[PDB]
């Protein structure tokens, strides 16, 4: 495990820092220059890129210290632990705000006034950074630079009280809160999208509008396509219900749900294994102890590579890159 750490992490963390810094800085430049931070969602996307930047700028010191002793001092050990937790806790909170922003705008039809868009986004973002700072305060206090087995190490030294409280709070803030928000928000968004979703016929091209409906053949307005009976047929050509296909939303705010939903799902796939093993390692209910100790180190690496995956999601899943690529040519 110690030799695997000296071999695997230095080149891995170097590649994550190169791909991560260039990618996340491009997101910041595209939000400031192309989008101009006009919408409310753009301010939280900018803070999410800053959350990743603050996190990934600590990788050169972790990459270096994976193969040799800690030589930056106790002051840098405390500072770089703060940037890790502010970047980690900060990031997950801005993903929750982007999910809440979409839930209220799609499910409840709420909108920020043009004059109060920049004012609301700035005040709530400062409050989020303050809550992310207070969540990192315990980790900055107890993480120190001490010597263990004649080797200088920058690691956590929490008493049994604050260590148990650290573990449960990291799970509540990084695993229970985002997952509890995911199930309530995205289901509610899926419910309202399904009712308003339009369906196009593959034969004649007849686009079924739910707001208008089809009063002619006994379909009152505002009815869902899934709620229409099986014996129903197309008004133009009279084809069957099985030939009708789905239509993508014309509104970019409705198509943007897939971008933020992926960001949330990818966060869980990378950070849940770490959050679960620290809970199993701290609260040894039935627990073999060496397996949980090595598993905490392996799952931490996975979580630390997550910083460079956010710009890759906006490139492939998001249409904001393909639109910018067409503008860059003609
Ligand atoms: C100062 O603490 C930091 C801020 O506060 C939270 C904890 C965080 N811990 C740091 C994060 C960098 C760190 C690390 O990433 N490690 C440990 C050693 C290790 N050894 C082998 C493998 C292996 F086998 F899986 F490859 C993985 C790993 C994972 C280390 C390189 C300095 C420990
Ligand atoms: Zn038809």
Curated annotation (Swiss-Prot):
Reported effect, residue 83 to R? In PCLUD; likely pathogenic; loss of CCL2 or CCL13 cytokine-mediated signaling pathway; loss of expression at the cell surface; contrary to wild-type, does not rescue CCL2 or CCL13 cytokine-mediated calcium mobilization and cell migration, when transfected in CCR2-null monocytic THP-1 cells
Q: In which tissues is it expressed?
A: Expressed by monocytes and IL2-activated NK cells. Abundantly expressed on CD14+/CD16- monocytes and weakly on CD14+/CD16+ monocytes, type 2 dendritic cells (DCs) and plasmacytoid DCs (at protein level).
Cell membrane is among the record's keywords: yes
**PTMs per UniProt:** N-glycosylated. Sulfation increases the affinity for both monomeric and dimeric CCL2 with stronger binding to the monomeric form. Binding of sulfated CCR2 to CCL2 promotes conversion of CCL2 from dimer to monomer.
Q: Which cysteines are joined by disulfide bonds?
A: 77-154
**What are the protein's UniProt keywords?**
Cell membrane, Disease variant, Disulfide bond, G-protein coupled receptor, Glycoprotein, Host-virus interaction, Inflammatory response, Membrane, Phosphoprotein, Receptor, Sulfation, Transducer, Transmembrane, Transmembrane helix
- Please tell me, according to the UniProt entry, what happens when changing residue 28 to I: Confers relative resistance to infection by HIV-1; delay in disease progression in African Americans but not in Caucasians; no effect on expression at the cell surface, nor on CCL2 or CCL13 cytokine-mediated signaling pathway
**Induction pattern:** Up-regulated by CREB3. In NK cells, induced by IL2.
Topology relative to the membrane: Multi-pass membrane protein
| Modified-residue entries (Phosphotyrosine), positions | 103
Tell me the domain of life: Eukaryota
Instruction: Quote a single Gene Ontology cellular component term.
Output: cytoplasm
Main subcellular localisation: membrane
- Where are the bilayer-spanning segments? 7-34, 45-64, 79-100, 118-142, 171-190, 259-283, 295-318
All ranges on the Extracellular side of the membrane: 65-78, 143-170, 284-294
* Membrane side Cytoplasmic: residue ranges: 35-44, 101-117, 191-258
In Gene Ontology terms, what is a biological process of this protein?
positive regulation of monocyte chemotaxis
Question: Could you cite one Gene Ontology molecular function of this protein?
Answer: chemokine (C-C motif) ligand 2 binding
Protein role: Key functional receptor for CCL2 but can also bind CCL7, and CCL12. Also transduces signaling mediated by CCL13. Its binding with CCL2 on monocytes and macrophages mediates chemotaxis and migration induction through the activation of the PI3K cascade, the small G protein Rac and lamellipodium protrusion. Also acts as a receptor for the beta-defensin DEFB106A/DEFB106B. Regulates the expression of T-cell inflammatory cytokines and T-cell differentiation, promoting the differentiation of T-cells into T-helper 17 cells (Th17) during inflammation.
Q: Provide the family line.
A: Belongs to the G-protein coupled receptor 1 family.
Subunit note:
Interacts with ARRB1. Interacts (via extracellular N-terminal region) with beta-defensin DEFB106A/DEFB106B; this interaction may preferentially require specific tyrosine sulfation on CCR2. Interacts with NUP85; the interaction is required for CCR2 clusters formation on the cell membrane and CCR2 signaling.
Disease link: Polycystic lung disease: An autosomal recessive disease characterized by pulmonary alveolar proteinosis, marked peribronchovascular and parenchymal lymphocytosis, peribronchiolar pulmonary fibrosis, progressive diffuse parenchymal lung cyst formation and enlargement, progressive obstructive airflow limitation, and recurrent secondary infections. Additional features may include digital clubbing, allergies, and atopic dermatitis.
Q: What is this protein called?
A: C-C chemokine receptor type 2
Task: Please report the organism this UniProt entry assigns to the protein.
Answer: Homo sapiens
The full protein's residues present here are 37 to 321 of 374
């Amino acid at each position: 495990v110690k030799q695997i750490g000296a071999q695997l992490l230095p080149p891995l963390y170097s590649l994550v820092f190169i791909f991560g810094f260039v990618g996340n800085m491009l997101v910041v430049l595209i939000l400031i220059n192309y989008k101009k931070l006009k919408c409310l969602t753009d301010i939280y996307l900018l803070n999410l890129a800053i959350s990743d930047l603050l996190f990934l700028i600590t990788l050169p010191l972790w990459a270096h210290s994976a193969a040799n002793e800690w030589v930056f001092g106790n002051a840098m050990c405390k500072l770089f632990t703060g940037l890790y937790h502010i970047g980690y806790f900060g990031g997950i909170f801005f993903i929750i705000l982007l999910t809440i922003d979409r839930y209220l705008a799609i499910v409840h039809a709420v909108f920020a006034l043009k004059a109060r868009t920049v004012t609301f986004g700035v005040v709530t973002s400062v409050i989020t950074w303050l809550v992310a700072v207070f969540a990192s305060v315990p980790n900055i206090i107890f993480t120190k630079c001490q010597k263990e087995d004649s080797v200088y190490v920058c690691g956590p030294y929490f008493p049994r009280g604050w260590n148990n409280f650290h573990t449960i709070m990291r799970n509540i803030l990084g695993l229970v809160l985002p997952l509890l928000i995911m199930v309530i928000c995205y289901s509610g968004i899926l419910k309202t999208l399904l009712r308003m979703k339009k369906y196009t016929c593959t034969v004649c091209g007849y686009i079924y509008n739910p707001e208008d409906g089809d009063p002619d053949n006994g379909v009152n307005p505002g009815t869902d396509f899934k709620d229409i009976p099986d014996d129903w047929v197309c008004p133009l050509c009279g084809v069957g219900k099985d030939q009708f296909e789905e239509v993508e939303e014309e509104k970019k705010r409705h198509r943007d749900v897939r971008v933020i939903f992926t960001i949330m799902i990818v966060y869980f796939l990378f950070w849940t294994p770490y959050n679960i093993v620290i809970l199993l390692n701290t609260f040894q209910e039935f627990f073999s102890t060496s397996q949980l100790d090595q598993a905490t180190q392996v799952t931490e690496t996975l979580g630390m590579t997550h910083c460079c995956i956010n710009p890759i999601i906006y490139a492939f899943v998001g249409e904001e890159f393909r639109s910018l690529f067409h503008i860059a040519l003609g």
